[PDB]
Design a protein around this ligand. Sequence first.
Ligand code: HEM
Ligand code: HEM
Ligand SMILES: Cc1cc(N)nc(CCc2cc(CC[C@H]3CCN3C)cc(F)c2F)c1
Ligand SMILES: Cc1cc(N)nc(CCc2cc(CC[C@H]3CCN3C)cc(F)c2F)c1
Ligand SMILES: C[C@H](O)[C@H](O)[C@H]1CNc2nc(N)[nH]c(=O)c2N1
Ligand SMILES: C[C@H](O)[C@H](O)[C@H]1CNc2nc(N)[nH]c(=O)c2N1
Ligand SMILES: [Zn+2]
Lengths: 416, 414
Amino acid sequence: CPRFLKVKNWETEVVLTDTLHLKSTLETGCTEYICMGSIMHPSPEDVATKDQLFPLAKEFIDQYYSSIKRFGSKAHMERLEEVNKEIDTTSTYQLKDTELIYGAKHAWRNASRCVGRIQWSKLQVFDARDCTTAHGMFNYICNHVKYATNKGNLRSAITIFPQRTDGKHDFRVWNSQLIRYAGYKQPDGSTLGDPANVQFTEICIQQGWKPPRGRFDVLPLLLQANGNDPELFQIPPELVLEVPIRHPKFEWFKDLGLKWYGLPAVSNMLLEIGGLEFSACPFSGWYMGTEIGVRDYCDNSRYNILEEVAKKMNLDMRKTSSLWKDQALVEINIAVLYSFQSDKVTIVDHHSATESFIKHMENEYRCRGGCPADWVWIVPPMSGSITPVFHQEMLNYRLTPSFEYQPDPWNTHVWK
Amino acid sequence: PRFLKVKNWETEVVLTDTLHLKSTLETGCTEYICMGSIMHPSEDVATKDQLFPLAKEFIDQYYSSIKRFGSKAHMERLEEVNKEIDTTSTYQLKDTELIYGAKHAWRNASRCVGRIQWSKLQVFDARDCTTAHGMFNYICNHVKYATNKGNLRSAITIFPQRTDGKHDFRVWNSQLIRYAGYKQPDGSTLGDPANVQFTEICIQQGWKPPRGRFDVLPLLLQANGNDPELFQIPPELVLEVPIRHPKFEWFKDLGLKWYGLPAVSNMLLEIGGLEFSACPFSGWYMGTEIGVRDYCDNSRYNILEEVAKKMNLDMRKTSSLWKDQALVEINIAVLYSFQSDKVTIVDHHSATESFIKHMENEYRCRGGCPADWVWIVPPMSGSITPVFHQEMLNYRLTPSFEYQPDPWNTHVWK
Ligand code: HEM
Ligand code: HEM
Ligand SMILES: Cc1cc(N)nc(CCc2cc(CC[C@H]3CCN3C)cc(F)c2F)c1
Ligand SMILES: Cc1cc(N)nc(CCc2cc(CC[C@H]3CCN3C)cc(F)c2F)c1
Ligand SMILES: C[C@H](O)[C@H](O)[C@H]1CNc2nc(N)[nH]c(=O)c2N1
Ligand SMILES: C[C@H](O)[C@H](O)[C@H]1CNc2nc(N)[nH]c(=O)c2N1
Ligand SMILES: [Zn+2]
């Protein structure tokens, strides 16, 4: 208890009532005495036990048969019976393809930090549980990228590799995203390319990558299968769609030489379904403009171009109160959105995205009894209070199935 | 129950929080649900029994603050408050405790980005006040001192504490200086839509409204639980700034102005178990409070179409970011205007930068700093300010400013 929880929207006075939070399972890290809502990561070869796994699978199977309006049927009981026996005789169990598709869509649906969840039920699930080698992983991932890119008309997809077993046979993508640019720490302390990727770039070079040492080098895939040491693969360049950034008004903006890739595809999170742990589960969607235009380009520890853009705008940069940073930021974000649209590559501005999410969230409250949301992540990094989410109260809690974080593999891997 | 670390992800600075171990009011979150974006998470007079421990704890931390813990003065100041809660069901704060309590409420204000200034706070003890006329007197002295011809100075005025619920001092205004908002026949709003109800309540009490766009509201002052009385602030005390733009000469043609003095007057100050239901307090503005929220909220002055229209921007699709462009211009105007009229104002880049510096001070000397990221990050340009990337721990320390019910919903007239 309590059975009911109200959220208000302070721009429209609309009030919603949440009962879904009663099904939350994991801890948030908050207590009655302290709130950790702005902490990024709250919360070994160790794996669930038989007794731990029984209730987690039952809970998930019950949920799945509830969703197909067959709860308590004979099929329901026989699925429970089958799974309880696998767990007894093998200490693990295998999802039916229909449960694997359900669990993945619902991990997306339950992702409280995702603003794009109105699309959750339209998600292409690529079952890759038959993969046994890194080459096989590389083939599955290329088909993922091609399907998802779709010549600019991007479609959301996830590829799911074999689940963890004893913890020593994990499948991992070592990339944090399938497509990222490389970062090269120079001897003089400067950074070429993407500073966020300096460490991963160095691991790739050590594993034998020959870097072109440019500003926008796509990194190779580093892929670990069945617990073996990882292996480098170059993504075929014709499968990486990229967009040159230009500005509709400023002639000079193309002279900055900026570009970005089309397909955002997280590959380092763990997918938890019914107590099973899919440690390799790359998933992709399309970009919200500000992810590129504010964070990737203007974060001080990223490409950090505000200074250069402001100079070409001839803004007063001597004091902060001129708001030269804020002016350049908007123009950079107009250019990003202009470029992706002109190339007919799918992208969504932050106004459209937040407005869609408010509608999604209301529908979820209406049809499901709630929608976990992380205000700190849902609100866009620019122009927050002129998007509907800023004024929207949100409840954050953890439903399963879910995408979770997991430690970087180089910290844990045992080299053979 | 450990030390907790917070990390800034831009600078990779890590601070260790021990202070949260001393908090005792609830946040409203649980281990299963986080509520950090709820605005108001969840006869309100404590009895004698609740009151002494609260009081004992406040006196304890006061004497600990002045390096005289367990002293003679401390031993006897305790017995004094014990005896007093006994015989009167309440107790009275010394002048020094009142000032320390007030400054430390500001210091514990998790939602306040401005707290680098917490100890430069002018405290006006108005606990001898007994009537709305006396309240109006103390308030005009506040406004005049805090305005200071444009060199604004932080201040609080503290009216008598709650006793039995029936004798309650309240400023019915949410802020000492606000513009009236008028419901129109055609259904629209002239002036500030945020105060449409309150504007009607003052009309219902005899206020003749100029029905203009920027009408300063009267004070509605309730003393000792009586019906509230209206008062006109002497206009020579209300400092305003006409908003113009340093590039666009058509911006003055918008006819916009705002008041220099932001003064919250609807909150409750809680010190040592005592409740000061009238405690108006004031500082100076961060430019976004006016330029983003007051001017560009939908439920507020809502001037964005107008501005981008005179900027001749493409307003057909959202992805021209025509709202984002017009918002930066409006906020440049606001900052340029105050600075040109030498009225104290702070931009959100400098204010968040100061707050990070304040956070370092507080972790160093106090072992923490409760901070509400949802409220600390500015309503525009978030991730180009240092606070966006700063992890924050939010917890509830007393003394504290609390919310209280709107007065019109509680008051039974006679
Ligand atoms: C289809 C369009 C999509 C849009 C517009 C979108 C948008 C976003 C954005 C802006 C974030 C914040 C990311 C950040 O700032 O780092 C996010 C987070 C996230 N998204 Fe979505 N996303 C989409 C698709 C998906 C899909 C297909 C999945 C999974 C099947 C997904 C799962 C997640 C998860 C788990 C997070 C949390 C990431 C983290 O904690 O680092 N998203 N999304
Ligand atoms: C001196 C300059 C100051 C600045 C620049 C400043 C800035 C701010 C800002 C931007 C907010 C968020 C306001 C909102 O969105 O409603 C805020 C909230 C707050 N401030 Fe400060 N402030 C200052 C002085 C003060 C003083 C003197 C006090 C008390 C003595 C104070 C106590 C508070 C409280 C309690 C809140 C939270 C109000 C709420 O939750 O509604 N501030 N401040
Ligand atoms: C499936 C999916 C769809 C969409 N749209 N976004 C994501 C998040 C991944 C993602 C997020 C961002 C924003 C800036 C990030 C980088 C550091 N800061 C947290 C930049 C990317 F390049 C990226 F790939 C996942
Ligand atoms: C003491 C003190 C100093 C400073 N600088 N700010 C405050 C907050 C008060 C305050 C805050 C705002 C923000 C816009 C509206 C939308 C929500 N919020 C009420 C608009 C004001 F007009 C105002 F007065 C208090
Ligand atoms: C729902 C949410 O709590 C609400 O809109 C908050 C968000 N953060 C805020 N932050 C500030 N500074 N001021 C506000 O009024 C709000 N409103
Ligand atoms: C400190 C804070 O938790 C952290 O910087 C968060 C803020 N909100 C965010 N929101 C999104 N979408 N992505 C982020 O990386 C962050 N970073
Ligand atoms: Zn919380």
